[PDB]
Amino acid sequence: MKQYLELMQKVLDEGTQKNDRTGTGTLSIFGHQMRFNLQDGFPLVTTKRCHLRSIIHELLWFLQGDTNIAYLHENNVTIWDEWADENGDLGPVYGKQWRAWPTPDGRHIDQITTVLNQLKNDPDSRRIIVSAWNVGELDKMALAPCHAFFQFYVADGKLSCQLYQRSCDVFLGLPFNIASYALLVHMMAQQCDLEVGDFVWTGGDTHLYSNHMDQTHLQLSREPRPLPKLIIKRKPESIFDYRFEDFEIEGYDPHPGIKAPVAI
């Protein structure tokens, strides 16, 4: 996508060498922002093939409040295998914080239901926010949240959303993350009778791993194709009642996949 390849070129042109946990080695910049108008098309990267079925199933899993990979395995999705413990558990990562953030006084807050009711009843609110950054539970999580905090906004009948991503593997993780939140915006907008607005992506430590550079330059040699279109085929009674089959992506004509090694 034009904005995504510009970001890749910016990391390459302006980034600095940085180690990670012992680890692999990165090139990193700090601070970036880009905007996808979702009325232009669904922002699924076209300069390499991406696995949308995994994106959809992961988001439905988050929305259920699940943090065990059993559901993902029942749908042949392996993207979390490397972080799960021997029972398939990840600890209280995204889905648990979204649906049941634990308070100090024994309550749990369903932030997704909260922002659905704000969008329906108080869309001018300046605090329609979901955070996964539960400081007091980070030590129980298999990974600290990368897509850590997000905010919705309504204007002119359109729903927008801004994500703060504190750490971002630009080659492997970011295509998935963009498509995931874009999908969530469409579902929310459907539930609240709004049109889609912008997805605004903001990055903290935004980096390319050193073993992804030949793959990154291969992708950069390619011309983006027209964006695909997202069609939702049903209006479920709640944001938690969507099914994989309710979604169809039309016109996705990507360049070939590019394989790259994960950095656990």
Ligand X SMILES: Nc1nc(N)c2c(n1)CC[C@H](CNc1ccc(C(=O)N[C@@H](CCC(=O)O)C(=O)O)cc1)N2Cc1cn([C@H]2C[C@H](O)[C@@H](COP(=O)(O)O)O2)c(=O)[nH]c1=O
Ligand Y SMILES: Cc1cn([C@H]2C[C@H](O)[C@@H](COP(=O)(O)O)O2)c(=O)[nH]c1=O
Ligand Z SMILES: Nc1nc(N)c2c(n1)CCC(CNc1ccc(C(=O)N[C@@H](CCC(=O)O)C(=O)O)cc1)=N2
Q: Is 143 in the site for ligand X (CB under 6 A)?
A: yes
Q: Judged by CB, which is closer to its own copies: 30, or 244?
A: 30
Query: 100: which 2 tokens?
Result: 């049941």
Quote the CA–CA distance of 213 and 215 in Å, as a whole number: 5
- Convert 151-182 to b/e letters by CB count within 10 Å (16 or more is b): bbbbeeebbbbbbbbbbbbbbbbbbbbbbbbb
x-marked contacts with ligand Z along 168-207 as a string, rule CB under 6 A: -x--xx-xx-------------------------------
Residue from 2, 6, 9, 19 binding its own copies (CB under 8 A): 19
What are the residues whose beta carbons fall under 8 Å from the beta carbon of 59, sequence distance 6 or more?
Answer: 180, 183, 184
x-marked contacts with its own copies along 75-104 as a string, rule CB under 8 A: --------------------------xxxx
Q: Judged by CB, which is closer to ligand X: 168, or 189?
A: 168
- Size of residue set near its own copies by CB under 8 A: 50
Q: Judged by CB, which is closer to ligand Y: 58, or 198?
A: 58
* Local structure of 117: helix, strand or coil: helix
Query: 255: which 2 tokens?
Result: 């360049």
Residue from 13, 74, 105, 237 binding its own copies (CB under 8 A): 105
Q: Is 173 in the site for ligand Y (CB under 6 A)?
A: yes
Residue with tokens 């880009």: 34
Beta strands in the chain (DSSP E): 16-18, 26-37, 101-102, 108-109, 129-131, 147-155, 158-169, 195-209, 229-232, 247-250
CB of 122 to its own copies, least distance (A): 9
Q: Judged by CB, which is closer to ligand X: 27, or 190?
A: 27
Residue from 27, 52, 99, 169 binding ligand Y (CB under 6 A): 169
- Based on the residue annotation, tell me whether 146 is a catalytic residue of this protein: yes
Contact in structure between 94 and 60 (CB atoms under 8 Å)? no
Q: Which residues bind ligand Y (CB under 6 A)?
A: 20, 126-127, 143-144, 146-147, 167-169, 173, 177
